[PDB]
């Protein structure tokens, strides 16, 4: 799974 705190600026759903 992606680490969603790799870059907090990324919203993975859009």
């Amino acid at each position: 799974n992606p680490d969603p705190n790799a870059n907090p600026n990324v919203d993975p759903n859009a």
Partner: antibody
Amino acid sequence: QVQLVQSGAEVKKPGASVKVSCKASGYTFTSYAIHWVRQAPGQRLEWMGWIKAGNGNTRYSQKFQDRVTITRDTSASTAYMELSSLRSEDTAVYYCALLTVIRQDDTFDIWGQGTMVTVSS
Amino acid sequence: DIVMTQSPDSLAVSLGERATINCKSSQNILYSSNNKNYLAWYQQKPGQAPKLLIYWASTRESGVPDRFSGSGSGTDFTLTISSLQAEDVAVYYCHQYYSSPLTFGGGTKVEIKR
């Protein structure tokens, strides 16, 4: 007109510390994360860490996690990076960046102009 | 730690021909839960900070010319410049944001043959 504006070039002695400011204007300062990315002479882009500009919370690259300190001052719309125990290998251009702000409401990416730090006596 | 390896490290094509830049991640960066590859492409011209061209491996950033296209999936990606303009001279980087730490490739210097 979203702008990130960094402090001017500096020369610091080996073992000293350097602090680079990154003024961020044109948008809600507390909304996004400001990253710090450096680039040595002739070498690649190297991510150092980010700071959540609202939270104040941080993540540092492992390589730098005992040497780097990233802060923010919301009233001054400014992020800062500090690098201690400098070595000549740290001679580089340091950037702040709003890296890949990906949203359905516009995806944008905005870098500072970069700051030259020379480690030298 | 995901490492990013680009090939070639420099290429030289005559104006109006395609420039092909390849990039490999040491691990998969496709998220099968949302079918998105966590890859980006930057173009960095001398004296300047990198500029974003492509994200999600193949979506163009607002304002980027159509000759810039990214493809690939999983662990193999490619930046294709379909007709190289004089002003496309720069070093190009791929960039993963699947896992922390964020990492970039080594760069592909793209230069015009004339």
